């Protein structure tokens, strides 16, 4: 029973993802986050091996929560009459990357390189586990400020990864690719790479490049901060209008701008402590 295993603290946030509380597992005082999702609000459903009908978000989290990774891991979950409750890891101290960029402004390229590298490794892990997040953005990335490690959250818009076309989408429109805007069609990996280009611009310029549909489909990336030529090239490559012109994850991580990445501990000591 959920009520006796966890002590519930303050609300951390609420929105399309449900309501999330700070918590502590009474068994070992382990810090957790406690996410409540209303059953009426669950779009896609899935099945566990046991055949239990659960939100898709639980299926996806289970697929990516084995072993260590840059994903906030699902530790347990419960069904209630009108909702599901998810028990998630809670690193401490933590700040999401949206708030971090708001407070710090455009990030030094060394710091953006370290963050972006870790996001790539986490997204690779998801895809290797058969999971497409479909809502990569700074808001859905937590920074462990002491360890210098980034963690993906909020798989509520995600899907099982497939090689055929997607025609549904409930992620963030300003991170969505022009083929979705124009045709309501996209493929998983190339749409993910588009959102990663948006994210990288966001890091190095201090905000996302596009706010309107016309800008998303227009194909013009104006740089509002000084950004190195190598970094601009990688961003513009990720934001190629034609999906097949975008880099693979391998090509991103082999890009000249991505070389000589800092370790997480170095990232924390230089930029976060």
């Amino acid at each position: 029973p959920l009520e006796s295993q966890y002590q519930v603290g303050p609300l951390l946030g609420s929105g399309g993802f449900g309501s999330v509380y700070s918590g502590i597992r009474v068994s070992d005082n382990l810090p957790v986050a406690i996410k409540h999702v209303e059953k009426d609000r669950i779009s896609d459903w899935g099945e566990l091996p046991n055949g239990t009908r659960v939100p898709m978000e639980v299926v996806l989290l289970k697929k990516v929560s084995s072993g260590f990774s840059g994903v906030i891991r699902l530790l347990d979950w419960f069904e209630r009459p009108d909702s599901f409750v998810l028990i998630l890891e809670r690193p401490e101290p933590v700040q999401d990357l949206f708030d971090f960029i708001t407070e710090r402004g455009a990030l030094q390229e060394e710091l953006a390189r370290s963050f972006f590298w870790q996001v790539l490794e986490a997204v690779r892990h998801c895809h290797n586990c058969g999971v497409l997040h479909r809502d990569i953005k700074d808001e859905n990335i937590l920074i462990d400020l002491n360890r210098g490690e980034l963690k993906l959250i909020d798989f509520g818009s995600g899907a099982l990864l497939k090689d055929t076309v997607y025609t549904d989408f409930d992620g963030t429109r300003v991170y969505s690719p022009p083929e979705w805007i124009r045709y309501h069609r996209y493929h998983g990996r190339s749409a993910a790479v588009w959102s990663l280009g948006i994210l990288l611009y966001d890091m190095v310029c201090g905000d996302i490049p596009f706010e309107h549909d016309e800008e998303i489909i227009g194909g013009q990336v104006f740089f509002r901060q000084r950004v190195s030529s190598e970094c601009q090239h990688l961003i513009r490559w990720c934001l190629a209008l034609r999906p097949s012109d975008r880099p693979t994850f391998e090509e991103i991580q082999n890009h000249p701008w991505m070389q000589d990445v800092l370790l997480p501990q170095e990232t924390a000591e230089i930029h976060l402590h």
Binding site: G16, F17, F98, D135, S157, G171, T172, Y175, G206
Partner: peptide, 9 residues
């Protein structure tokens, strides 16, 4: 200029 969050889900 105004930086803002963008809801999803």
């Amino acid at each position: 200029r105004k930086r803002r969050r963008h809801p999803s889900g």
